[PDB]
Every structure is written in structure tokens, then in C-alpha cells.
Design an enzyme around this catalytic site. Structure first.
Site, PDB file in Angstrom:
ATOM      1  N   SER A 181      46.790  63.993  27.736  1.00 11.55           N
ATOM      2  CA  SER A 181      47.419  62.721  28.048  1.00 11.55           C
ATOM      3  C   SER A 181      46.374  61.628  28.143  1.00 11.55           C
ATOM      4  O   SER A 181      45.207  61.882  28.448  1.00 11.55           O
ATOM      5  CB  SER A 181      48.190  62.793  29.369  1.00 11.55           C
ATOM      6  OG  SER A 181      47.335  63.043  30.494  1.00 11.55           O
ATOM      7  N   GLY A 223      44.133  69.235  30.754  1.00  9.48           N
ATOM      8  CA  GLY A 223      45.010  68.622  31.729  1.00  9.48           C
ATOM      9  C   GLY A 223      46.433  69.095  31.544  1.00  9.48           C
ATOM     10  O   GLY A 223      46.774  69.823  30.600  1.00  9.48           O
ATOM     11  N   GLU A 230      40.270  66.486   5.343  1.00 13.80           N
ATOM     12  CA  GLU A 230      41.270  65.853   4.494  1.00 13.80           C
ATOM     13  C   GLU A 230      42.216  64.943   5.271  1.00 13.80           C
ATOM     14  O   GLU A 230      42.770  64.005   4.685  1.00 13.80           O
ATOM     15  CB  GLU A 230      42.055  66.903   3.719  1.00 13.80           C
ATOM     16  CG  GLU A 230      42.473  66.400   2.359  1.00 13.80           C
ATOM     17  CD  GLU A 230      43.302  67.407   1.606  1.00 13.80           C
ATOM     18  OE1 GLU A 230      43.142  68.614   1.929  1.00 13.80           O
ATOM     19  OE2 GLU A 230      44.148  66.985   0.757  1.00 13.80           O
ATOM     20  N   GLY A 254      46.649  61.066  32.692  1.00 20.33           N
ATOM     21  CA  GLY A 254      46.053  61.939  33.690  1.00 20.33           C
ATOM     22  C   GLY A 254      44.607  61.576  33.987  1.00 20.33           C
ATOM     23  O   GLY A 254      43.916  60.932  33.184  1.00 20.33           O
ATOM     24  N   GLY A 255      44.148  61.969  35.180  1.00 21.78           N
ATOM     25  CA  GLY A 255      42.735  61.814  35.488  1.00 21.78           C
ATOM     26  C   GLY A 255      41.883  62.836  34.751  1.00 21.78           C
ATOM     27  O   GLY A 255      40.805  62.507  34.241  1.00 21.78           O
TER      28      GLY A 255
HETATM   29  N1  GTP Z   1      54.986  64.641  26.960  1.00 20.36           N
HETATM   30  C1  GTP Z   1      54.479  65.160  28.064  1.00 20.36           C
HETATM   31  N2  GTP Z   1      53.803  64.319  28.916  1.00 20.36           N
HETATM   32  C2  GTP Z   1      53.268  64.825  30.050  1.00 20.36           C
HETATM   33  C3  GTP Z   1      53.401  66.169  30.386  1.00 20.36           C
HETATM   34  N3  GTP Z   1      52.775  66.346  31.570  1.00 20.36           N
HETATM   35  C4  GTP Z   1      52.266  65.166  31.985  1.00 20.36           C
HETATM   36  N4  GTP Z   1      52.564  64.217  31.042  1.00 20.36           N
HETATM   37  C5  GTP Z   1      52.204  62.792  31.061  1.00 20.36           C
HETATM   38  O1  GTP Z   1      50.813  62.713  31.328  1.00 20.36           O
HETATM   39  C6  GTP Z   1      50.548  61.674  32.265  1.00 20.36           C
HETATM   40  C7  GTP Z   1      49.894  62.324  33.476  1.00 20.36           C
HETATM   41  O2  GTP Z   1      48.804  63.079  33.019  1.00 20.36           O
HETATM   42  P1  GTP Z   1      48.656  64.647  33.367  1.00 20.36           P
HETATM   43  O3  GTP Z   1      48.220  65.510  32.201  1.00 20.36           O
HETATM   44  O4  GTP Z   1      49.982  65.106  33.951  1.00 20.36           O
HETATM   45  O5  GTP Z   1      47.486  64.603  34.482  1.00 20.36           O
HETATM   46  P2  GTP Z   1      46.138  65.475  34.290  1.00 20.36           P
HETATM   47  O6  GTP Z   1      45.470  65.384  32.935  1.00 20.36           O
HETATM   48  O7  GTP Z   1      46.504  66.895  34.613  1.00 20.36           O
HETATM   49  O8  GTP Z   1      45.079  64.847  35.306  1.00 20.36           O
HETATM   50  P3  GTP Z   1      45.225  65.030  36.898  1.00 20.36           P
HETATM   51  O9  GTP Z   1      46.527  65.729  37.316  1.00 20.36           O
HETATM   52  O10 GTP Z   1      45.046  63.574  37.334  1.00 20.36           O
HETATM   53  O11 GTP Z   1      44.082  65.937  37.351  1.00 20.36           O
HETATM   54  C8  GTP Z   1      51.872  60.981  32.566  1.00 20.36           C
HETATM   55  O12 GTP Z   1      52.005  59.858  31.722  1.00 20.36           O
HETATM   56  C9  GTP Z   1      52.872  62.080  32.228  1.00 20.36           C
HETATM   57  O13 GTP Z   1      54.189  61.644  31.956  1.00 20.36           O
HETATM   58  C10 GTP Z   1      54.092  67.035  29.532  1.00 20.36           C
HETATM   59  O14 GTP Z   1      54.220  68.239  29.810  1.00 20.36           O
HETATM   60  N5  GTP Z   1      54.629  66.513  28.358  1.00 20.36           N
END
Ligand code: GTP
Ligand code: GDP
Ligand code: GWC
Ligand code: CA
Ligand code: CL
Ligand code: MG
Ligand code: MG
EC number: 3.6.5.-
Lengths: 54, 346, 424, 437
Positions: free
Chosen positions: D140, D10, D254, D143-144
Site C-alpha cells: 500500500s 505490509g 519487456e 500503511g506505515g
Molecule cells: N485493496 C486493499 N487495500 C488494503 C488492504 N489492507 C490495507 N489496505 C489499504 O492500505 C492502507 C493501509 O496500509 P496497510 O498495508 O494496511 O498498513 P501497513 O503497510 O501494514 O503499515 P502499518 O500497519 O502502518 O504497520 C489503507 O489505505 C488500506 O485501505 C487490503 O487487504 N486490500
């Protein structure tokens, strides 16, 4: 407070410091779950298409 | 404009604080579960400290110090005094105390070692027992522990103070309630007004089964006492009368004979726990009003007995003290558009 | 990724044409389809709305539908008329006479298969079609009756795509015929069942805005549609511009719609412009975009509670200031945001401003106050229906009074379901 | 030498992976094309860095990494970015449409038929491993994809690699940078389905990184780029012992042994100090005692909570830079006297310490200043359960109205999975409470 297992090398060292002593499902069940959800999905879609055909 | 939420409706002090907050026109009250608050007047039990300070755009402030129960529940406070180097087992202003668990760590096998030395040395050997209704003051242990095990919660039992200071006329006992506010900066503020919760029954050193001349609770005295209110309205003598009395009868001031010691005890207790509960670098901030309960012996020596973490005031003093809480604890953090506290520092 | 756009009937095609003018300008494309902008933010997601054609040309993925050719001709002759592919003009000749029944059951049925042919042709050239947006009024005949026919057909052929509509609501202050409430109620019944998200563009709100605050004494449809194209460019900016939040129609549905039926959004816009010089400050932008006076659905947001909100700031400004101001709105009015959806207000920022503004803000609310709109319609509906007035225009096309009763009930149910969550 | 495969899932997982692998290449002197001149064993070896890089006959050092997203736009940036040459195309896997912020869409609908391809590419990496010890998984909670596809992937990894260790780096959801209103649903769902498939998880609350960035980096409004360079410093600090000579935390087993006595309680808190702005003109370099002391300020934790009102089960100190044992022991002694550090009765009170003399590498042009010494503390304290409280509370608020649930059920998930996941989290919260009060 005693220092033990001191290991060390050109990159760095490591050691412990004590202050006080002590007072899964199978591939089968998984693809069954994925297919159950696909069945519920296909059924809801059939309900929808039948309603639209009405 | 600031927002607050009220999660303990059964608190007289903070009921009054809610009223004064609203009456400024700069504070509005939200529903108990609306998390977008600046201020939380929290519940007494299981207050959700872990959910405070995570609201962006909100400086959050609560009226309790997470951790302060270690000072404010009787077994805890005994444990804290004995084990903390700042207070130590040699503490000169706390009575000898021990933590006892019911039949159903414990200290009765360490108790008895002291009890029997006190009975052999032919010293006064009254001991009191209580936990955090159900009190036994006795002269021999096998009544104490026998009573403890009929109940089912941890108890503390401690050297009863056999030679208290007795107010005349009346030859009666009393305790001194001090109200201390600790702010988010960890300033310790002692309220200028204390109260003497007195007994209305001359002190009968004979049978310790009558609790009317040995326990100074405002409740037991209104209900089960003969002449509740003969000497002072509501069995409550305030500080000016008591200072007058010490001057007239004993040739001293309240400040000299007693308050110096109370300030020393208050400051010592709070400074002891300050590292465990201070919110100086925390994502939310705490203040808290405490009620320190003191007992003076016949030699004008002050003793601490309980710290209570959710105290009520005396009806005369509610207004002034609640306005002081607003001034020092709340407006300090959230400003609006000759102080009644003595700051404790050394 | 790709969106297919359908505009139906007089109002659908007039606002649709204005929408394509406005966002074509925003993306640097000229009436011939030739890109002539400077920046490259303009092209990163240009394929969401446009097809690339021979000779580096950009062709809107737009189908134009009507039962009479008057307005479609007016579009072809209009300013951007030659940007659309001519094969995507699908029209009949008889019109629909402001009659939902002609649009849905008799005249429209005759035309709908060829519209769906063009739909299918556009969709099969799509790498990953996310769904459809439709523009239409609810009070005429083609837009309301045939557009809702289209929508349920499109759902049948594409039941796993998003269906989004911009739906103009009829107002007696801006009225063509008396049967508009009938038409609207029949349509809302359709929309409740077959769209995922509907922008309720109230003609009452647009009239009041032109009159009370733009100080226009005799507002025209041109004046109303300027407001509509501003709102449309605003609510679709996160779709067609690359940002931190890579948005699409489905994420917008998921986040905005806690329960399937309550998907009727109140749009808002700031600063309100007429067809100026003082730059707005971010606190001003934020106070305006939340003001009842800047919303395009005539409702009082204080009369209800916000389920979800999505806000879009277009311009070069302080993201820090934007965050502070949005948080200040929520924290100073938290009464009006449901507590059982945590953090229900999300904000996006686009560096490119709309034409003629250094900064702007668009508001997309799902409020329970939207019930007020439907209540209005239902009252007007009932006023006629209890005396069965004007029904003969409909029974003469095959319809039964029972169908009117059903749609009335479904709308009243929708009103009740909103009221359920206004007190939760 | 035993290999480690990193899997990034993701948007958050991929962008954080980008940051970490950029860092690794800087630290081991690997260039953007994959050439490492200090590597005299051309075409192979069993050095320490080889646990993260394989080698081609042409001298190219290639991350043992898989990037997987359900939509293409973010991994496309890896495919066209500075380190394009670093990664072999079939390690960068993309779908056509994302999971729409919907755990069930990622786990069930879209997951079901990219899972086998992902496992096949993972096997193509494992087959290049003489003795694979397991996986580091980045994603994350919100994210979905990051929630739903990750939990599916974790289940399958337990099946196809049952003896291997699985570690998580998990981004916990914060409103100031969150993208979706349903992130609590996804969080709880993916935690419940992953709990038994993960040996040790490092949770990073975007709220903490965000605040650290504002307070100590003077960044007005941090971007993902800010946050990820900081998170990658912490991750590099955690993995440095798998990539360098040493005797502490040398294999993935570990981490479980030292940090997780009870298997369910496998969420160590990470504290990292010092964080210093590159734009700070005059900086007084902090001592061992000052940075070790900063390890016990909540404002330096990866998750905001108060360890004073919890109990410790383990505690590791990882230094990088000019540090020697005796200075560490002095710091610890004084710290023990001035701070509330309570271990559980059945655990020793103590610290496992690891020092690497190379000080932290900082990305040129980044926000972080070079420093002469820095530490990351890994402590398994019950206080991190505060985070679960917060998350669970938000969940309970939405679910009591079944708000948005229809979006999950319509992907084929059953309403009961919601209350099952929540059931599990209630259990977790209780485990924590009675280990530590
Ligand atoms: N620290 C950090 N958090 C991130 C980043 N990108 C997204 N997030 C966090 O991740 C969450 C959203 O999940 P994403 O990874 O963006 O979504 P995904 O896994 O790609 O899933 P979908 O887009 O729903 O298909 C939110 O809480 C964001 O703030 C990043 O580059 N760094
Ligand atoms: N806002 C707006 N409303 C319009 C426009 N044209 C028509 N309407 C409204 O739409 C309704 C008439 O429907 P219309 O689109 O002309 O009929 P159709 O061609 O059969 O779909 C009435 O409520 C009109 O007020 C327009 O350009 N803008
Ligand atoms: C919790 O409320 C939410 C509402 C919307 C969303 N997303 C998916 C968005 N989508 C689109 Cl198309 N435009 C948006 C514009 C502004 C803010 C947004 F967030 C937008 C996420 C959460
Ligand atoms: Ca080599
Ligand atoms: Cl295995
Ligand atoms: Mg007309
Ligand atoms: Mg994504």
C-alpha cells in the site's frame, strides 16, 4: 491499419497492430542516512531525559 | 439540503444563480475550498476537473464541460471544423478560416494560395483577423500578417462577410447572440430569447480602419460610437422586434429565414464534440451555458463566427435565463421539495 | 500489543473497578478469573488487558494505588475484588488530604518507588508492551498529584511507550473541596507535557447528563460512574476486540493528535442509559453520538471545530447504513470539520454490543471547543489565586507560588493554542 | 527461463499476495500442499510457471515469494491458513510492532533493523535462481510499513541487484476503506523515495475497486476479501505472460520496453472487463467487441480518471479466453472511429495484443462469475496524473499547517524530506502535463 509480428502457439497468440506512424545512492550513503536519523532520535531522547532529570 | 461553492465571483450569470439557489432554502453555500459540495460553479481557468467526483456520499455537478474549450477559442474551433468529418472543410455555414502563428501548425502558406485566387478572380477580398482589442480588417494580406507578428499569440484570419444584412432604418450591421444550455444528460437547450447586438453607425464599405460600423461589440459601441442608443435601448434589439421587422420589410419570419439554420449549427457543433466531453458514464457530471454568435448575410444565410464558453446575458433576460439554468441544469440533478428552452434533437 | 493499567486515588480506583467489571463481563470472564463465555471473539485479543495465569485464569494487568486504604479495601471487598492480583495493591496510610502537593512532592514521593516496582514487574512479563492507561481524578490529591508524579516517572523509565489517561475534571456542581481548581490546573500542566492522549471526563457533563436527561434528581457518584464505564468500554473496544482495523494506543495517538499538546479528547456515548426496550436506529445512534447532550466534557462542539473524530458502533447493524449516516453528518455540517485535515472522521464497527444494549455508539472527538473546559478551570483558579486563598495548604508542603503561576500560564497557553486552530 | 521473486510488504501487500497466489495455484493446477500432477519433470524444470514456482525433490511447487510485515497478526494468518504448506517458514517474516501508520517509523526507526534480515532471506531465494530477472513488489501507499519499509527495501534492492527489474503493484489510498488520516503524507513520501528504483508501477485506487465491487458485483459494503480477489484477477492478467507460453511481455524488461518510454512516467493505467456477479442468474456473455469497448469506460479502470483529456504513450491488450486476432482488429477499428484516443506525436498509434486461450480462472465460491472471454488493457496515459493531483492536493492541505508532522520528525526524519518529496511530485505532475497537453 496493419498487423505485424504475429507469433502463435498452442496457448495463444500475440501480435502488434499499427494505426498510424509517429507524427542511485550506494550502500554507504544509505546506512549513513539511517544512522543520521537514529542520531536525531537519540538526541531528542536525551533532551527529554535531561528535562525529566531537572 | 444541497451545498454549492462559488469559484468565479466575476460571473454575472452565476452570481445570479447563487442568489436564486440560496433563496430556495434548500441550498447552502460553502467556502470556495470546502470539497464536500454537491455543486461547483467553477473558475474559468484551470478548473480542477480531476478532483471532482471523488467524495463518497456526494453526487457532484459542475457548470463546465472539460474539453469544451476546443469549441470556444478561435484557433481551436477552426481546427475542429476543418478536421472533423461531421463538419468537414466543406462546411457551408462557417467562413473560410486559417490559423496563423506569429513570427516569434501554421497555415499562412495555405492561406496565400486562396487569397491570391480571390484577388485574381476579382472577388471581394476583405479578410478579418483576430485571436482570443487588436483587430485588423484589410484588403491585402501584407497588412494582416504584418499586424499579427506585432502581437505574440496565435491568430485566425477568415473571409470577412462583405454583404451582410443591414437593418433599416439605419443601414447598420448586427450579430445574433443565442444562449444554449447543455445539461448533464447532453440535452441541448436553446434559449427562446436571442439578442441582436447592433451597430449605431451606417455600414461604410469604404475604409476598413473604422471599426465602428464593422464590429458589433457592446463595449466599442457605448464608448466610441456617435449615437449609441438612437434606435434601441443599449444597442440591443430583441427577437420580437426583429421578427416584426422581417415580416414587415422582408416578408418572412425569424424562425424560417434564420432560426432553422441556427438550430442546425448549434446541434451540429455540439453533437460533433459529444463523444469528447459527455459525462454520461463519468464519476462527476457537467453542464455548461454557451453563447453562440451568428451573422446573417443579405441573402438570409446564417454564419457562425464565435462560440463563447463563459457568456454574459442581457440585463432584461438574466432573471428568466438564470431561473432556467436552475430548473433544467441544477434541480434536474438535485430536486427540490411551459419551458423557456427549445430542445434541439433530430 | 499489551496495555498496563494504573488506577490512583479514590476516583481513579472507583472508576477503575467499574471499568474492570464492565469489560470483564464483555470478555466473558467471571469474578474469579475463569472464562465462561461462549464466543471466541472474546478471547482473540484478551491479552491486551489480561495476563494468563495458572489453571486457565485471567488476571487484569492492573495496578491499584492510593495513599489511604479506605477505597482500596472497598475494591477488594467489592464485586470483582478478587480478580486482581493482591501484590498489585500498593497503598499508604496517611492519605493526601485533597492536596496536590502531598500527592506529588511529599506523601506521594514516599510511595511512588514501590508502585514503579510493580509497574516494572508487570511490564517485563509483556511480549510487546504498547503503554499505559491511568484512571484518576484531577481535583483530589492522590489521583492528581501522585498520578501525575507516576506519569512523569513512567515516562522517564519508558520514554518510547504510549501514556494514555482517563482524567475526571472537577465541577462545583460535584465538588469535594474548594481547592479542586488549584489541583486541576497543576495536573493539566503535567498532562499537557507527559501524556499522548487524554480522555477529558468532565464531572459537570456527567452531572448534567444524569440530571437533565436521565431525570435523576440526586445523582450519586454511582450514577456518574455508570456513564464513565460505558464511555470507557466504548473508547477501548477497538483495542480489545479483533476487527478490520487492528487498533492500538499508538495508531490512535498518531491519527487523533495533529499537534502534540492538543491531545485532549471529548468522549461521547449513545444511547444514554440509566442504572431501555426501544431499539435505536442507526440514524438515531448517529445523531445522538454527535449531540452536545451526549458528551462527557461540558463543551459546545458548535463553539469550536473538529480536528479529528473517531467513532465506534457496537452491535449487529448495516455497515452500509453506518457509512451513509456518518457521511451525512459530515456533509450536512462540514462547517465544523477542519478542511485542512482531509477525511478526518473514521469509523469502526464491532459486532459485540455492550451489556444490555442491542446497539450503541461511542464518540471520540478532538475538538477545539475543549478549550471551554480549561477556560472554566482557569477562571475558578484565578478567582482564588488573585487573593492567594488557600495557598497555605500548598506552601506548607514546600511549594512556591511561582509554580502555581507557571501552571496557570501553561493552561492559558493551551487555551490559546486551541483558539489558534479554531479560526485557521 | 528466468525467475521472478514476489515480495509482499505490509498488510495490503500480504493480503493481496495471498489472493494472487491462491489464484496462481488454481490456474496452474497446483494443490494447497504444493503438488502439481501435470508437472512430469519432477524436482525441477525450466517451464514457464517455474518463473514463479521452484520445485522440491518431493514434487512440491513453492512460490518464489517473500512476505514481510512489521507486526505478526496478518502473516500469522498465512502461516495457519489453507496454503500454510505452500510457503517455507523462512519466507514469512514478521516484526513485533508495526510502523503505526507512520512512514518514518517504517523507513527509519523499525526499518533499520529488520532490513538486513529481509535482504538475507531474499538472497536465499535469489541463490536458487539460475537467471533471476527481478522483483514484483506489492504494498500500500498508505500503511506505515507498506510505504516506509517498502521504500527502504527498494533502495537496497537497487544496490544489491542493480541490473534487475523491479515492478510495483501499489494500492492508492481511498477514504471509504482507508485506516489512517496521514495516508497522503505516506503516499507522497514513499513515491518520491521509490520513483528512481522502480521500472514500472501498477497503481490501484481502492476507490475504483470499491465502486466496481458495488456496481458490478452487487456487494453492499465490500471487504478487503472482495477487493483482493478482484485485484488478484487483474494482477494475474498482468503476469500471465510471465507464467505461460507466449511472445508478449515475456520478461520484466519487456514491461518497461512496451509500456514506459519515459522512465519517470512509469504508472500504466489498467482497465479490466468484464466483471460479472456470480449471483447473476441469466447472463448474456459479452463479445470481443463489447469487452474491448469496455476497456475505454472510466468505470472499469483501476484508477478513476478521464483518458479522453490526456495522451497515450503505449497500449497493450491482454485477452484470456475465446479470442482470435481478427475479432480484436474489428473491435479496434470501430472503437477508433467512436472514441477519443490521442497518442503523443512521437509514438505510433497502435496496440500490442496478447491472447491466452485459457479463460480466467475464478475462485470457487468467490463473487466473480466465469466468463468465456475477458481482457485487461494496460495503457500509459497522461490522465493518470489526475490521481497525483488529488493526492498532492490533500498533502498540501495538511502540510500547510504542519499537522501531524511532529510524528514523523520524532522518528528522526527531517521536516525537509516532506518538502523534498512534495518538490519531486510537483516535477512529476509537470512532466505529465507537458507530455500530454
Ligand atoms: N485493496 C486493499 N487495500 C488494503 C488492504 N489492507 C490495507 N489496505 C489499504 O492500505 C492502507 C493501509 O496500509 P496497510 O498495508 O494496511 O498498513 P501497513 O503497510 O501494514 O503499515 P502499518 O500497519 O502502518 O504497520 C489503507 O489505505 C488500506 O485501505 C487490503 O487487504 N486490500
Ligand atoms: N466522576 C467521579 N468523580 C469522583 C469520584 N470520586 C471522587 N470524584 C471527584 O474527584 C475529586 C476528588 O478527588 P479524589 O479522587 O476523591 O481524591 P484522591 O483520592 O486524593 O485522588 C472531586 O472532584 C470528586 O468530585 C467518582 O467516583 N466519580
Ligand atoms: C482519522 O482519524 C482516525 C482516528 C482513529 C484511528 N484509529 C487508529 C482508531 N483507533 C482506535 Cl484505538 N479506535 C478507533 C475507533 C474508531 C475509529 C478509529 F479509526 C479508531 C484512525 C484514524
Ligand atoms: Ca517440473
Ligand atoms: Cl545485478
Ligand atoms: Mg475524596
Ligand atoms: Mg500493519
Amino acid at each position: 491499419m496493419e498487423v505485424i509480428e504475429l507469433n502463435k502457439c498452442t496457448s495463444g497468440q500475440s501480435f502488434e497492430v499499427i494505426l498510424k506512424p509517429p507524427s542511485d545512492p550506494s550502500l554507504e550513503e544509505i546506512q549513513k542516512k539511517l544512522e543520521a536519523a537514529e542520531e536525531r532520535r537519540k538526541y531528542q531522547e536525551a533532551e527529554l531525559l535531561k528535562h525529566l532529570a531537572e | 439540503m444541497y451545498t454549492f461553492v462559488v469559484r468565479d465571483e466575476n460571473s454575472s450569470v452565476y452570481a445570479e444563480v447563487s442568489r436564486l439557489l440560496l433563496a430556495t432554502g434548500q441550498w447552502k453555500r460553502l467556502r470556495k475550498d470546502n470539497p464536500r459540495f454537491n455543486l461547483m460553479l467553477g473558475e474559468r481557468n484551470r478548473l480542477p476537473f480531476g478532483r471532482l467526483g471523488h467524495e463518497p456520499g456526494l453526487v457532484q455537478l459542475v457548470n463546465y464541460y472539460r474539453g469544451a474549450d476546443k469549441l470556444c477559442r478561435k484557433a481551436s474551433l477552426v481546427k475542429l471544423i476543418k478536421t472533423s468529418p461531421e463538419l468537414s472543410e466543406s462546411c457551408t455555414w462557417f467562413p473560410e478560416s486559417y490559423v496563423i502563428y506569429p513570427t516569434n501548425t501554421d497555415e499562412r502558406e495555405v492561406f496565400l494560395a486562396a487569397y491570391n485566387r480571390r484577388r485574381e478572380g476579382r472577388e471581394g477580398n476583405v479578410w478579418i483577423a483576430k485571436s482570443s482589442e487588436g483587430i485588423l480588417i484589410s484588403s491585402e494580406a501584407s497588412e494582416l500578417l504584418d499586424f499579427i507578428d506585432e502581437q505574440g499569440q496565435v491568430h485566425v484570419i477568415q473571409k470577412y462577410l462583405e454583404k451582410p444584412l443591414l437593418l433599416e432604418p439605419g443601414h447598420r450591421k448586427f450579430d445574433i447572440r443565442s444562449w444554449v444550455l447543455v445539461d448533464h444528460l447532453y440535452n441541448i437547450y436553446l434559449y427562446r430569447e436571442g439578442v441582436l447586438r447592433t451597430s449605431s453607425e451606417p455600414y461604410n464599405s469604404a475604409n476598413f480602419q473604422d471599426k465602428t460600423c464593422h464590429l458589433t461589440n457592446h463595449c466599442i459601441q457605448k464608448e466610441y460610437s456617435k449615437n449609441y442608443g438612437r434606435y434601441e435601448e443599449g444597442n440591443e434589439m430583441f427577437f420580437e422586434e426583429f421578427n416584426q421587422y422581417l415580416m414587415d420589410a422582408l416578408n418572412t419570419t425569424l424562425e424560417n429565414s434564420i432560426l432553422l439554420q441556427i438550430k442546425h449549427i448549434i446541434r451540429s457543433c455540439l453533437m460533433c464534440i459529444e463523444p469528447a466531453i459527455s459525462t454520461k458514464h463519468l464519476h462527476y457530471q457537467s453542464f455548461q451555458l454557451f453563447g453562440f454568435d451568428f451573422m446573417v448575410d443579405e441573402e438570409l444565410k446564417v454564419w457562425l463566427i464565435e462560440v463563447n464558453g463563459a457568456p454574459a446575458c442581457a440585463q432584461k433576460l438574466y432573471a428568466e435565463l438564470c431561473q432556467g439554468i436552475v430548473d433544467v441544469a441544477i434541480s434536474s440533478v438535485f430536486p427540490l421539495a411551459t419551458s423557456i428552452f427549445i430542445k434541439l434533437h433530430h | 500489543r499489551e496495555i498496563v493499567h494504573i488506577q490512583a486515588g479514590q476516583c481513579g480506583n472507583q472508576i477503575g473497578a467499574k471499568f474492570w467489571e464492565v469489560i470483564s463481563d464483555e470478555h466473558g470472564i467471571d469474578p474469579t478469573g475463569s472464562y465462561h463465555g461462549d464466543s471466541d471473539l472474546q478471547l482473540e485479543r484478551i491479552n491486551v488487558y489480561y495476563n494468563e495465569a495458572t489453571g486457565n485464569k485471567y488476571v487484569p494487568r492492573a495496578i491499584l494505588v492510593d495513599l489511604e486504604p479506605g477505597t482500596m479495601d472497598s475494591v477488594r471487598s467489592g464485586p470483582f475484588g478478587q480478580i486482581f492480583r493482591p501484590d498489585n495493591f500498593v497503598f499508604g496510610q496517611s492519605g493526601a488530604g485533597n492536596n496536590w502537593a502531598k500527592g506529588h512532592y511529599t506523601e506521594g514521593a514516599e510511595l511512588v518507588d514501590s508502585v514503579l516496582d510493580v509497574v516494572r514487574k508487570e511490564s517485563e512479563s509483556c511480549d510487546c508492551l504498547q503503554g499505559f492507561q491511568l484512571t484518576h481524578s484531577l481535583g483530589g490529591g492522590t489521583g492528581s498529584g501522585m498520578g501525575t508524579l507516576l506519569i512523569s516517572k513512567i515516562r522517564e523509565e519508558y520514554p518510547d511507550r504510549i501514556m494514555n489517561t482517563f482524567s475526571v475534571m472537577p465541577s462545583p456542581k460535584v465538588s469535594d473541596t474548594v481547592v479542586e481548581p488549584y489541583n486541576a490546573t497543576l495536573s493539566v500542566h503535567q498532562l499537557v507535557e507527559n501524556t499522548d492522549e487524554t480522555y477529558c471526563i468532565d464531572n459537570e457533563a456527567l452531572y448534567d447528563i444524569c440530571f437533565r436527561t436521565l431525570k435523576l434528581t440526586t445523582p450519586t457518584y454511582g450514577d456518574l460512574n455508570h456513564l464513565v464505564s460505558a464511555t470507557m468500554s466504548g473508547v477501548t473496544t477497538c483495542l480489545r476486540f479483533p476487527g478490520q482495523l487492528n487498533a492500538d494506543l499508538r495508531k490512535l495517538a498518531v491519527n487523533m493528535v495533529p499537534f502534540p499538546r492538543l491531545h485532549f479528547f471529548m468522549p461521547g456515548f449513545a444511547p444514554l442509559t440509566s442504572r431501555q426496550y426501544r431499539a435505536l436506529t442507526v440514524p438515531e445512534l448517529t445523531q445522538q453520538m454527535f449531540d452536545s447532550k451526549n458528551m462527557m466534557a461540558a463543551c459546545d462542539p458548535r463553539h469550536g471545530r473538529y480536528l479529528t473524530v473517531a467513532a465506534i458502533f457496537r452491535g449487529r447493524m448495516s455497515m452500509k447504513e453506518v457509512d451513509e449516516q456518518m457521511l451525512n453528518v459530515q456533509n450536512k455540517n462540514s462547517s465544523y470539520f477542519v478542511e485542512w485535515i482531509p477525511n478526518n472522521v473514521k469509523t469502526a464497527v464491532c459486532d459485540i454490543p455492550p451489556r444490555g444494549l442491542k446497539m450503541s455508539a461511542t464518540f471520540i472527538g478532538n475538538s477545539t471547543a475543549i478549550q471551554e473546559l480549561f477556560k472554566r478551570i482557569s477562571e475558578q483558579f484565578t478567582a482564588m489565586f488573585r487573593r492567594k486563598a488557600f495557598l497555605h495548604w500548598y506552601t506548607g508542603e514546600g511549594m512556591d507560588e511561582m509554580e502555581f503561576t507557571e501552571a496557570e500560564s501553561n493552561m492559558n497557553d493551551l487555551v490559546s493554542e486551541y483558539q489558534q486552530y479554531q479560526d485557521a | 527461463m528466468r525467475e521472478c521473486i514476489s515480495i509482499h510488504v505490509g498488510q495490503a501487500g500480504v493480503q493481496i499476495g495471498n489472493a494472487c497466489w491462491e489464484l496462481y495455484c488454481l490456474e496452474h493446477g497446483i494443490q494447497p500442499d504444493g503438488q502439481m500432477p501435470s508437472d512430469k519433470t519432477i524436482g525441477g524444470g525450466d517451464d514457464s510457471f517455474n518463473t514463479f514456482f521452484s520445485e522440491t525433490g518431493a514434487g512440491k511447487h513453492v512460490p518464489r515469494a517473500v512476505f514481510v510485515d512489521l507486526e505478526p497478526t496478518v502473516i500469522d494468518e498465512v502461516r495457519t491458513g489453507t496454503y500454510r504448506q505452500l510457503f517455507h517458514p523462512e519466507q514469512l517474516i514478521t516484526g513485533k510492532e508495526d510502523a503505526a501508520n507512520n512512514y518514518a517509523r517504517g523507513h527509519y526507526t523499525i526499518g533499520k533493523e529488520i532490513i538486513d534480515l529481509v535482504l538475507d532471506r531474499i538472497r536465499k531465494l535469489a541463490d536458487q535462481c539460475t537467471g533471476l530477472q527481478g522483483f514484483l513488489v506489492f504494498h500500500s501507499f498508505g500503511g506505515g510499513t507498506g510505504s516506509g519499509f517498502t521504500s527502504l527495501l527498494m533502495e537496497r534492492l537497487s544496490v544489491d541487484y542493480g541490473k534487475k527489474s523491479k515492478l510495483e503493484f501499489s494500492i492508492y489510498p481511498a477514504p471509504q476503506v482507508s485506516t489512517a488520516v496521514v495516508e497522503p503524507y505516506n503516499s507522497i513520501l514513499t513515491t518520491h523515495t521509490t520513483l528512481e528504483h522502480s521500472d514500472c508501477a501498477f497503481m490501484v485506487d481502492n476507490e475504483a475497486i470499491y465502486d466496481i465491487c458495488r456496481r458490478n458485483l452487487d456487494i453492499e459494503r465490500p471487504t478487503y476479501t472482495n477487493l483482493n480477489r478482484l485485484i488478484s484477477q487483474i494482477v494475474s492478467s498482468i503476469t500471465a505472460s510471465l507464467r505461460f507460453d507466449g511472445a508478449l511481455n515475456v520478461d520484466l524488461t519487456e514491461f518497461q520496453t512496451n509500456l514506459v518510454p519515459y522512465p519517470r512516467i512509469h504508472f500504466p493505467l489498467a482497465t479490466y472487463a468484464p466483471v460479472i456477479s456470480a449471483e447473476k442468474a441469466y447472463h448474456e456473455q459479452l463479445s470481443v467487441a463489447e469487452i474491448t469497448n469496455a476497456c475505454f469506460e472510466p468505470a472499469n479502470q483501476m484508477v478513476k480518471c478521464d483518458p479522453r483529456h490526456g495522451k497515450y504513450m503505449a497500449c497493450c491488450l491482454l485477452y484470456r479466453g475465446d479470442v482470435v486476432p481478427k475479432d480484436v482488429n474489428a473491435a479496434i477499428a470501430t472503437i477508433k472511429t467512436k472514441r477519443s484516443i490521442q497518442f503523443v506525436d512521437w509514438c505510433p498509434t497502435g496496440f500490442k495484443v496478447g491472447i491466452n486461450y485459457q479463460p480466467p480462472t475464478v475462485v470457487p465460491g468467490g463473487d466473480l462469475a466465469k466468463v468465456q472471454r475477458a481482457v485487461c488493457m494496460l495503457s500509459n496515459t497522461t490522465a493518470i496524473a489526475e490521481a497525483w493531483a488529488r493526492l498532492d492536493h490533500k498533502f498540501d492541505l495538511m502540510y500547510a499547517k504542519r499537522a501531524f508532522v511532529h510524528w514523523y520528525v520524532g522518528e528522526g526524519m527531517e521536516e525537509g524530506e516532506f518538502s523534498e518529496a512534495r518538490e519531486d511530485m510537483a516535477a512529476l505532475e509537470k512532466d505529465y502535463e507537458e507530455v500530454g497537453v
